[PDB]
Design a protein around this ligand. Sequence first.
Ligand SMILES: NS(=O)(=O)c1cc2c(cc1Cl)N[C@H]([C@H]1C[C@H]3C=C[C@@H]1C3)NS2(=O)=O
Ligand SMILES: NS(=O)(=O)c1cc2c(cc1Cl)N[C@H]([C@H]1C[C@H]3C=C[C@@H]1C3)NS2(=O)=O
Lengths: 107, 207, 124, 399
Amino acid sequence: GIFNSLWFSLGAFMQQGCDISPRSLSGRIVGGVWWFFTLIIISSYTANLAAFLTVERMVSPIESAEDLAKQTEIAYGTLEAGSTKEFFRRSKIAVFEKMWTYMKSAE
Amino acid sequence: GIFNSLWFSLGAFMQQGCDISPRSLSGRIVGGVWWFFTLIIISSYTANLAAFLTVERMVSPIESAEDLAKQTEIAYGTLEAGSTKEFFRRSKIAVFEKMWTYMKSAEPSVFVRTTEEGMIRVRKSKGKYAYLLESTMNEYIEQRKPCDTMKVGGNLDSKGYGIATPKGSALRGPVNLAVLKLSEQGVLDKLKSKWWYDKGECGKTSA
Amino acid sequence: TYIVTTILEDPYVMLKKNANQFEGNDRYEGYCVELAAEIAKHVGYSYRLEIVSDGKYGARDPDTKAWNGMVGELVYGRADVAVAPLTITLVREEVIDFSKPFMSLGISIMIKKPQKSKPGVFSF
Amino acid sequence: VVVTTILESPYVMMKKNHEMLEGNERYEGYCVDLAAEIAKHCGFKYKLTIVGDGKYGARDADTKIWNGMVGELVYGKADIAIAPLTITLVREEVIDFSKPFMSLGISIMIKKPQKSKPGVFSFLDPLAYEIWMCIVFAYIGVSVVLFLVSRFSPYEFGIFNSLWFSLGAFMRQGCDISPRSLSGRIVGGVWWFFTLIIISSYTANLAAFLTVERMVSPIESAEDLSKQTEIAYGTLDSGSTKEFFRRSKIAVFDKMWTYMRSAEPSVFVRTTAEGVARVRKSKGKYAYLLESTMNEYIEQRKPCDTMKVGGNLDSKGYGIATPKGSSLGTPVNLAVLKLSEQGVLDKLKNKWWYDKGECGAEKTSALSLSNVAGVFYILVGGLGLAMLVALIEFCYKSR
Ligand SMILES: NS(=O)(=O)c1cc2c(cc1Cl)N[C@H]([C@H]1C[C@H]3C=C[C@@H]1C3)NS2(=O)=O
Ligand SMILES: NS(=O)(=O)c1cc2c(cc1Cl)N[C@H]([C@H]1C[C@H]3C=C[C@@H]1C3)NS2(=O)=O
């Protein structure tokens, strides 16, 4: 009937059993193709769920000072009239020198 | 019976169906605990199979020259009486200086006499030895049977061979023009392709 | 005539399997040998295949200040030209004329490839 | 002396504050860094001049005149030259040269074809078609074997119900019938084991093959490119690439040079940026043949709307030039040897290239419907087929 048809279709999408099965050719085609569809979809869902559960936390691209300085799309600066500004003024390392050059003049 | 019992137990381990099911309590306990066991085992197998299929290839710890030098458990040296040895003698970079200091005095002599000698030395060693060599002969022999040698890392520096000639010789200009003509024509590429690739002694997502 | 210094290394200079049967320049067949043949055809100069007795490459010791190997034969007049693998560099170029390159190269690391267990039939 | 540059990037990068600078500090680049590094070891005065013609030496057949870069050195207008200048015989027959300080080669350049979404029938990729064919014929063989076993050795299992059972067991959905004999139960058991293994192998890594997108280039290489004619390729005008194709004697290069020469309009171009713009304003109908260095530099720079296909057709090396007979030829040669021995060249090349790569300097995301539409199409086709078949059977049994 229709009630049992819905029951069977649902019992095959969840991969559980089915107290009945189609007996004619024209119902068996439908059953088989529905089984193929649910196999594909359920395997996809399960795999992508596995992927989501072990999903790495958002790794921001600002992890390093060198990376934070090369990322000119994000502007950066040091507090003015402070000891940190003085340090970057006298900073001699490559990354600090480049950051100081970038921050010397920016609007 | 026993035949159907085996059939049912097998039909529940493969997660397929079962034309029958236990009807008493004492068979239902067994059925349920067997279902729990097969669930655990099959899930474990499937997950670890997924892991194996997307298994990363063996990443040798000799990827970098600095790593290959810090790994003193593996000895390394440069061919003696050669230009590479001279380069490492005059090498000024930190990694090269450290490698040169390590290779200056080591027993047995990390240096070698001939290229075949170094090849066999690395061959016999159970991975406890490393060797420095030009990027042409290395590939050529890595292509030759036995193919038990394998290059790791990339070229450390770019250089080139050359058709030498006595200083003040009269065959200097002609040879330069000759090599230029031979390089412009595909003759030289043809030679290299024929006598390096035509031999072929041995040999994340993917279907 | 021309005297040529080859280091006899695989595959730049190779001795023909019929070494005893073969004789002369035709006896030797290597990439260096074929290059020598091609360049000679380009210029037309007689030459005789030869190999350095010392079996060494350019290495000028500090104490003696003497060149050995193919470069040694070249500097002292023993060898006329050197069509062989010879890494062109500064100290060597300071004494001997280099023509323009004919092959790029680089130093590299070699290791005994660990055996990887190829999945057998029953890898599942 | 006088140092001449080509005003070509990244070898000549005009400084951003061009207004407030003059002299050797006008512009920046790898070429200027090398010029300073060599002036350190050579002790020769130089001026950062630029050639007026803005092009490299070419030898016209009729006038037999060197133009631009080579003309300056040959005709005394220049004393030295430091630039991305390519060596070659004809150019070397007129001026002394130095040793190479870079490796390169003629390379192709095109516009990045868009990322082709995994097409319909992407759910078969996880398994190679060989395995799919073996699976089909094993599903046939098992059902045939079960039919034979049951019919001729009974305790029903025809062929139709046998195929039904085998299919149901392959998809983990059991059926209403199970074999009752030993000879059918062995078949069922091996079928269950086989399907378990295959499904566990397939299921695993199935989102990737439904989500991964791989770009397919139209021009695989020079041979494939020259075989076709729908897409037009071009090259710089009055340069080493034109001279290389002109003197070519190889069949592919001969036909390629014939096609480029006999193509209207002229595929050629006055300057590199012109070719860049042409490929980036041609809907992927233009392919430009430039070196392997500029190509990579462009690839690393935004918007990164281009890519390199194939491998270098030939390696040439650059080289510092010098007028024939100039006393400066030897010291510059030894200087470049020394710098190569030092890490100056490798350091400069590694730093300048990939210094500011905007693009690229994977995540798991849900499945869109575009990725899994094929199975919906297949389902709907199956339903239509089932209704058609039932109507056919209905009419047939009516008669
Ligand atoms: N195929 S390859 O990389 O080994 C290679 C490498 C080189 C070749 C030719 C080949 Cl086939 N010739 C060039 C020379 C040709 C002319 C141009 C540079 C020199 C002079 N040098 S190279 O860059 O060292
Ligand atoms: N940056 S690179 O790998 O392309 C590269 C390539 C080359 C460099 C230096 C660098 Cl950094 N110098 C060599 C020269 C140096 C001496 C050795 C060969 C020539 C002469 N030619 S090269 O092989 O063309």
